[PDB]
Amino acid sequence: DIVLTQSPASLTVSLGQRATISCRASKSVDSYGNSFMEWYQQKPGQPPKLLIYRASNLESGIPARFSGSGSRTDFTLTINPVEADDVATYYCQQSNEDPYTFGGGTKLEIKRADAAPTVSIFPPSSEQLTSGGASVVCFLNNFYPKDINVKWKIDGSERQNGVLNSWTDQDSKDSTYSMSSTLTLTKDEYERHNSYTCEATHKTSTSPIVKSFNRNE
């Protein structure tokens, strides 16, 4: 029952450069001079896609930018040069002995020049203000790197709970990240206050990006 150890677990490479991903079997995966080792690309919301079979054979439809080498217990996936669309998790899988066991995966991110977020605040809809619930939404769009800090202010004062953040996967053309930040309150609470602020601190500037509104303006 063969363990595959994949390294590294995550990796960030620049466009045009080579990526090197490894895989180590707890025992030999070879029989009659062939290695029973496959590689896969998996993109979010899709099945794994077969890149290489038998350690080194390039699957039909797959660009030769992808190559595999190795024998016995040590195997290597190289991608070269790396392109925008290679954002994925990559997995090794042995086909020598069942159970037909997988690597833990390697997440590939793209390195790209720093970009500042575009920030946009949205007062609770008229419609929603009928529920006795209220959501203030803020989009921080198309930024790089992934590391971002968000701060909410109500009547000048910073607020901690009632806030949920969600991030997209790295974009496959422009290689940027985006984020949504929602503050939910009762309608009651919402209307006891008059000024709402969404504040973003990011690599790209020392001063934060402030976007704000006054109720019923």
Binding site: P48, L50, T118, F122
Partner: protein, 218 residues
Amino acid sequence: QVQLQQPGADLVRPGVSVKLSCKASGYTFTSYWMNWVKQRPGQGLEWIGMIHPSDSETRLSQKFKDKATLTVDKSSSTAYMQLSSPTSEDSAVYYCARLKPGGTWFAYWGQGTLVTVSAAKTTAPSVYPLAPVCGDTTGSSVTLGCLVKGYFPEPVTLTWNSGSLSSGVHTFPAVLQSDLYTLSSSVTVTSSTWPSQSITCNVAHPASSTKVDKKIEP
């Protein structure tokens, strides 16, 4: 051309057995080994077992011995798997995949059935429009949004202007709180074209037969 077709999602009650399906076409169903693999959300991949449709010879993972049962119907070209007495450890994407002719490698895959094992109650979303703040525009672009609030289970589908508006769109991963999901989407367009060109989010939650097209008013 070989197709492997599985339903997109399933909502199963705790303890009640569920049968997944994988319909094959574009080749001779009885000629190749069919494999199943489990993928828990945001996780890696595990091999469940394989079956040979010609005679239903089977090999199961010891890890799945008392969980999965694999069958086929030859006349329908359909592979099946039964998960007995479902728990929350059984929530995952389940894929069927078949081997290359004269090989041991998984060249063809289904699109996966998403199973959610949960007693929580099915619930329709609310669709609220995110129109920009008060005042004149001073930049080259406008960002609008759509909020999809408090639905269960996954998934929903969201499009902009029937899908004819696809670039500049960010639809964000849902967040589960209590037993309800919430997501939102944004769209950026050139500021010269709004409000002269109307913008509408199209939202579907098929579990609740919800189909809503919400217009974004200034």
